[PDB]
Design a protein around this nucleic acid. Sequence first.
RNA 1: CGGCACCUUACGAGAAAUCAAAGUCUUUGGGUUCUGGGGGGAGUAUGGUCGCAAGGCUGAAACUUAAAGGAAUUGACGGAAGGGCACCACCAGGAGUGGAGCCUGCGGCUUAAUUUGACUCAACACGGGGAAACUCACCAGGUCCAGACACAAUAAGGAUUGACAGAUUGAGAGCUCUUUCUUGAUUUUGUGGGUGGUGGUGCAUGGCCGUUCUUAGUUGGUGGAGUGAUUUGUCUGCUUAAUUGCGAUAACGAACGAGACCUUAACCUACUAAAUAGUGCUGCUAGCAUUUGCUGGUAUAGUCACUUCUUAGAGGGACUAUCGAUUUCAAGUCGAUGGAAGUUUGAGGCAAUAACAGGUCUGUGAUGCCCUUAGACGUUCUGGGCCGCACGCGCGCUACACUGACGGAGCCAGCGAGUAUAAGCCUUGGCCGAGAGGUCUGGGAAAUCUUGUGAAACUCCGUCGUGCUGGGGAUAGAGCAUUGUAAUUGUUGCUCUUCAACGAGGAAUUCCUAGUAAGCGCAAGUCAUCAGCUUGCGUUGAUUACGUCCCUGCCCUUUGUACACACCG
Lengths: 70, 57
Amino acid sequence: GGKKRKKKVYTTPKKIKHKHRKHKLAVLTYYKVDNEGLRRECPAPTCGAGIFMANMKDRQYCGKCHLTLK
Amino acid sequence: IDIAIRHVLMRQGVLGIKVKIMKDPAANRFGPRALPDAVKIAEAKDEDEVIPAPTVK
RNA sequence: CGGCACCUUACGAGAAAUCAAAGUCUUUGGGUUCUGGGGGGAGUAUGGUCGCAAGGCUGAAACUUAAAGGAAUUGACGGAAGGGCACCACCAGGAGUGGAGCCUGCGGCUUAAUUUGACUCAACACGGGGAAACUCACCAGGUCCAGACACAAUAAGGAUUGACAGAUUGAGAGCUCUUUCUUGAUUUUGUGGGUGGUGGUGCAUGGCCGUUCUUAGUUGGUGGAGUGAUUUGUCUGCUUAAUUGCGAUAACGAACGAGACCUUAACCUACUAAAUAGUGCUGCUAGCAUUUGCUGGUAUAGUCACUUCUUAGAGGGACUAUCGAUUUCAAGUCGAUGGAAGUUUGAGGCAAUAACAGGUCUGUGAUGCCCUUAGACGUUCUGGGCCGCACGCGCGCUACACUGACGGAGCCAGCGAGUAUAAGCCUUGGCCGAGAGGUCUGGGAAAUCUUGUGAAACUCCGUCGUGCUGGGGAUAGAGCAUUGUAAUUGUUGCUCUUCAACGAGGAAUUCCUAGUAAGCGCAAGUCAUCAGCUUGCGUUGAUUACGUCCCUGCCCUUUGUACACACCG
């Protein structure tokens, strides 16, 4: 019966998949409100306000959409 | 002849059922009403009372 | 009176075959002798006894074993008899195949994989199986859950959904990573429970198909026979394609199959109508001839006629009609005359009962069970394989030449198919290129156009002139295109060149009886491309029977059987 389809061998390791980075109040690491007193709100009109950016290796990018420059 | 065939899904497997019915040709409306080799010679009304030279008028 | 026997019946007997004794025997008893007590071991061993011997007579046990055996029934089988039938059988021939190159399927070897089913007819151009991707089930590698649902964990201080730069990858898969930009309860983790599977099992099944078997066969009611399994009906004779009829009869009346039936081919100047068919007439014309003629062209207005041709509906037509002969004079059979039709008029679809461990789980959201289900045997993506080649076999195509190759000329069928915001259908005309092919228009959802599918064999007139030669067109290089995302392992088409086997095929073996074989193309299916394949269609069109049981088989009867897994016993 199709030579009784056997076990199959592996040359690659089982790839542990991706995990979501459980952050601790990212709002508390964007905003800096001290006594009586934040990257950019995605210049595109797709959002208006409510979009922040993470700066690394010369990258200002948007997540609820995708603009990026420099 | 009318045939209906069904697959009866039992617990151990599938049963199959066939039902043929040979309806009488008399009830057939839009087709033949008898078998091909059915022949329907009828009786006679030949017998009657006669007389050699009558002319009634 | 005694004998040797025989015939009929079944009194009565018997398990029956059969028996006038094998009767007068559970209603058991005339007299008397011998023998047997499941099958083997075994008529063996031993002792005795007779024999010249060969051997005879008498004659155990251990041990072994579930049947051995009798008569009859149904079937099957016979190198048994009788009667029939068949080009999947022969006769008599034709075309061949088997020999060659190549196409293609099977095996084997190879391989990472060369996926798999089927193995006499009834596997092997079969799975509608002509696979570049897809198909796809195989191999190497990468992703997705498309895991519904109930709980439990978790969580809006975030269950988790994604996606930029580089790394990474076969790859512009956030597959995975430094990188945290976005999402908010749709989802992740665990149990239970699902779902899908071209994974297994066709020897667990449904349905379908093939075969037994393209033959004439099959069955019950009541009656008759038999203790019964069963049997007769269902048959001696003749006749037929035929268990189909004439008939015969312990049957009688039935039923299925066969036949009827349905589709199609052949005939109709006899009805009905054709602007999607045709023929004419009559206009407006052209070439010839001028006799008003011969050839054609055009007019879906000429407000023309009609139905031979063609189309399709309503019918008719063969029933063996008439006649001559043989036959139980019966069912039939052989010849003529008439006729389109005289094998069942030709050709098919449909097609009983009983079966096969025939094929298919790889057609199926047809399926039970087993397996598997997240690093998946689900699905999807990239690439390869199914094409791999010391070799064996089947279905084929092209050939081995002059009844021939070419080169011009003649240009004669029939069955069908076709689309429109395509991803494009049949494609006409016009124009380019040698050709393949390209482009601009036009017609056709079609008796309207493609299309008269001007098909190919075939006919004529020329070149070749007996030879592997202008026969044959393998293998191979260069080039031009086309389909497709992708032609390398040449997809296919065209041009130049290369010019291989093969000179008619061994032992073997297939198909076929008239518009048949053989030849020859054509269309449709598969289809983006590709037909040496099937399913149909027409064109040309034969030799030889019109019989037989020698071979291979099939049907019926008789007969034998120690067979019933049925002689492959």
